[model samples]
Target: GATAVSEWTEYKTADGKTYYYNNRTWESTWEKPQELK
Candidate 1:
C-alpha cells in the first residue's frame, strides 16, 4: 500500500489534536484509519 501511504496526510487541528486527511476522498478524521492499523 505504498500509494496508499502517500494518500493520507497527518496534521493537527487548531486545538492541537492530530487528525488524518484522505486526499482522494476529501475526508478527515481524528480516528485512526482501519486500513492503516
Candidate 2:
C-alpha cells in the first residue's frame, strides 16, 4: 500500500493533543510525529 507520514490528516483532539489517522490496517497514532525520528 502507498503510505507516508506526510499523507496523513493531522489534527487535534479535545484534550489538546495532536493526532494522525489512516484507513489502512485500521489504526491511528496520536502525537505531533515531532520528527520522523
Candidate 3:
C-alpha cells in the first residue's frame, strides 16, 4: 500500500520535481523549482 498524504504534504521526485496529493494519486503535473544561485 502507498503512504497517506494530505494537501499540506509535498511529494517529490528524485530529480527535484514536486507534486501534491489529490483524490487518490499525485497530481499529474510536476512542479520544478528555479535553480538555486
Candidate 4:
C-alpha cells in the first residue's frame, strides 16, 4: 500500500547542526546481534 508522508519535525544537535526526523525510525540496540553499520 502507498501512502503520503506527514509529521515533519526538526531539531538541532549538540554540534549546532540542524536535522529533520524522517517518520521512519527503528531501534535495534535491544537485539542480541544489534545490527548496525
Candidate 5:
C-alpha cells in the first residue's frame, strides 16, 4: 500500500451523477432519504 494520502471514493446513480466520498457523497443516493418515495 502507498504511504501517501490514501483516499477512497464511491459512485452513485443519484440524479444521474456520481459523487465522491465525504459530504459531497453523503448527499448522494447512497444514503436513504428521510421522506418516503
Candidate 6:
C-alpha cells in the first residue's frame, strides 16, 4: 500500500543530506523528499 508514510520514507544522514526511495534509486537532496509516483 502507498498509505504508510513511514514505510517507504525519507531519511537524513549525519552529513545533513536527505534521501528517499523512488523505484530502484536513492534520490538525494538538501531538501525534503516529495512525490512518490
lDDT of 1 by residue, 1-37 (tens): 2365667778997989988887778889888876665
Best-performing candidate as measured by TM-score: 1
RMSD of every prediction: 2.8, 3.5, 8.5, 8.8, 10.5, 4.7
* Residue pairs with clashing backbones, model 6: none
Question: Distance from true position, residue 17, model 2, in Å?
Answer: 0.6
Deviation of model 6 at 23, angstroms: 9.6
Better of 3 and 6 by lDDT: 6
TM-score of each model, paired residue for residue:
0.58, 0.39, 0.35, 0.34, 0.25, 0.36
Better of 1 and 3 by TM-score: 1
Stretches of candidate 3 off by over 4 Å are: 1-6, 23-37
Query: Model 5, range 1-37, lDDT digits (tens) per residue?
Result: 3223222345667677655443433444454333321
Better of 4 and 5 by TM-score: 4
In candidate 4 the C-alpha lDDT for residue 36 amounts to: 19
Clashes of each: 0, 0, 0, 0, 0, 0
Model 2: worst 10 consecutive residues (lDDT sum): 28-37
Pairs that collide, model 5:
none
User: 16, model 3: CA deviation in Å?
Assistant: 0.5
When summed lDDT is taken over every stretch of 10 residues in candidate 5, the lowest stretch is 1-10
Better structure of 4 and 6 per lDDT: 6
Give the alpha carbon lDDT tens digit for every residue of 1-37 in model 3.
2334333345789997766444344444444322211
In Å, residue 18's CA in model 4 sits off its true spot by 0.8
Stretches of model 1 off by over 4 angstroms after superposition: 1-4
The residue pairs found clashing in candidate 4 are none
Give the candidates in order of lDDT, highest first.
1, 2, 6, 3, 5, 4
Which segments of model 2 are wrong by more than 4 Å?
1-6, 31-37
Clashes of 2: 0
Question: For this target, which candidate reaches the highest lDDT against the unseen true structure?
Answer: 1
